[PDB]
Amino acid sequence: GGNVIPTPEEVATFLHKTVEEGGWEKCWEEEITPWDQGRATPLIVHLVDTSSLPLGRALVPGCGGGHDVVAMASPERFVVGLDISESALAKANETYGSSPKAEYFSFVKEDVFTWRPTELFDLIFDYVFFCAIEPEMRPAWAKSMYELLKPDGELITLMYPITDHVGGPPYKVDVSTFEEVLVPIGFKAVSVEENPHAIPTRKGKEKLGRWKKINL
Ligand SMILES: Nc1ncnc2c1ncn2[C@@H]1O[C@H](CSCC[C@H](N)C(=O)O)[C@@H](O)[C@H]1O
């Protein structure tokens, strides 16, 4: 029974007020976290349990409370959760840090736009991060996705929120918003599909995309 958080359209009316006052860290300190599902994203649980996510090294940018990081972690899928908020990662570690999966994941306080480890990622899963950033950061987001992926890596975007609302975060997006920043830098969409596991407040407001680099 997970229909307990506001629609993206409702979140967009107030979230900016705290982000503008004290950043994402203030949101986390004050428990103003209306994007947070309180559990792993149902689509992610489904894809993990049907072996429909690639194995290897995975990155979850703007991971927040880290639910999806932990759901994706396994002996063959090492997952890095990246967030700039100390309080977000404190909460993630408080919740999940003692999981037997702890040797297979790491919560790392780093900025997606600038952090570059020596070992890159087979997989990046972006959900509620592309829409969190200021709209003008979007071409830089695309270049960061390119740079953080190995040459045969895959970017998986749960593209959200596909809505008509004004303001943000979360800022409205559509498939063309992703295509416009990803294609010119050498990604190609493998497919774009509905998410039949969308929670009610997000049903019809998100689509799953898989992106690969056109040149190896
Ligand atoms: N440059 C950056 N690098 C890493 N994390 C960032 C960031 N800018 C914002 N964030 C983080 O992005 C998160 C957006 S909220 C979404 C959290 C998570 N994706 C979820 O679905 O629940 C916040 O936790 C915020 O601290």
Ligand SMILES: [Cl-]
């Ligand atoms: Cl579109």
